[PDB]
Amino acid sequence: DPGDQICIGYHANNSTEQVDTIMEKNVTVTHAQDILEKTHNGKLCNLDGVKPLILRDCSVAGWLLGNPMCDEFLNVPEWSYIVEKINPANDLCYPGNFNDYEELKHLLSRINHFEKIQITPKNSWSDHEASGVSSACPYQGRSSFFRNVVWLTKKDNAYPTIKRSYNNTNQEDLLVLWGIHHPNDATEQTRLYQNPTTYISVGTSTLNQKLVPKIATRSKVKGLSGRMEFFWTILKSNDAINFESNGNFIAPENAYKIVKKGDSTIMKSELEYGDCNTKCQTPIGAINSSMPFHNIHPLTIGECPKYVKSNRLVLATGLRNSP
């Protein structure tokens, strides 16, 4: 008659976690491990202790040149990363362009802190008018101008040749900005700077620039047919920059000390500050995860999981579950 018994068997449970293999889909297992983070907080946060520089409706250009609508940013603290809107409204208020802008921007992504200083006081232009202003550049309803540069025009009816020089006695490098104004016609030229044929020389240990205004008729932009073209350079410590101009010069007033370099980026996001903190930021929200992977956005900064385009990454840890 039937005696004693031993059996070999395996575990099962009420698990509904499915995994995939090459041969078989939607296989239900006893234990699995999701390795893919799929959620974020929908916010722009601090990175470790450090707040981002969130430009609002200001572009990098507007900020640095000192567009009057960007006065929030005249002197920003050390940032962790920079956020710019996709199409900032407050860019170059006076119509024109920024030379080597994407290169400046790329430089900027390697910087965590500027210290703005005055390199030339506005009360130093005694033979020229330093109050140039424009409707394209409004402050509080009335006509203003960039804050970090000066529009110099003839005083009385003369424009003496400007020869002004500045030695970077600071230990850190200076980002220095300037510009040239391109009038529409010869008549505008004399109204503003008297002299018909003008130039701008800018010199450094590495820079040897000569600019001449391009006086020609162009399409109206913001009611202005004129243009403002902007240039930048890095003045190393102990180097000097030499300006000589005979007109059409948009002169430097303030410049930026490069205080700290680091890993940083310029994120393109419509988000704004969400008064949070994270160790991983994406343009569409922050991530707090122990997962090795995430699929939120490819462009991240911080201590992040690795990005994949997958919707699901589930590792089977246990065995096949019996129905």
Partner: protein, 175 residues
């Protein structure tokens, strides 16, 4: 599949056994009860754990996309930059997905073998002292107390000490 074990000869898993992954059901004169196999369940949790840690560690150094901007007369190089970054995001996505698929099937076949290796561990120990029912169970040709079955679980089982009890029981039914 690669086995004929998990939903194979032992059709179904044991919902009552929650102490491990692989183990035993025992039935003698002293009631029933489940006992998880200590040796093969630990060797399986470690190996599987190691796999998930090896796979994550093998992906730490992996491509990182960075936003780069280009002007409107840099469209070739902007297109170059875009294709390069999507290229690496795709390549690592393939790497991630494909490795998970490949290790999942190996992981299932791994639990699977451990069920057959544990069954053959016992079937080689028991031999002619038990009847092989073919449902994952063994029916003893002798009496096995709750300390005899401890010997089958840890591989110490002494066969001749039960040979005759079994030899004779085989003589009764074959007589």
């Amino acid at each position: 599949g690669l086995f004929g074990a998990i939903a194979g000869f032992i059709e179904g898993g044991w919902q009552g056994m929650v102490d491990g992954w692989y183990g035993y059901h025992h039935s003698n004169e002293q009631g029933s009860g489940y006992a998880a196999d200590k040796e093969s369940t630990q060797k399986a949790i470690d190996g599987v754990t190691n796999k998930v840690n090896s796979i994550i560690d093998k992906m730490n150094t992996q491509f990182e996309a960075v936003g780069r901007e280009f002007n409107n007369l840099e469209r070739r190089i902007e297109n170059l930059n875009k294709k390069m970054e999507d290229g690496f995001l795709d390549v690592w996505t393939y790497n991630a997905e494909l490795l998970v698929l490949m290790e999942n099937e190996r992981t299932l076949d791994f639990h699977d073998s451990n069920v057959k290796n544990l069954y053959d561990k016992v079937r080689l120990q028991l031999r002619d002292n038990a009847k092989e029912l073919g449902n994952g169970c063994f029916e003893f040709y002798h009496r096995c107390d709750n300390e005899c079955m401890e010997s089958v679980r840890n591989g110490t089982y002494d066969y001749p000490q039960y040979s005759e009890e079994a030899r004779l029981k085989r003589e009764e039914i074959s007589g």
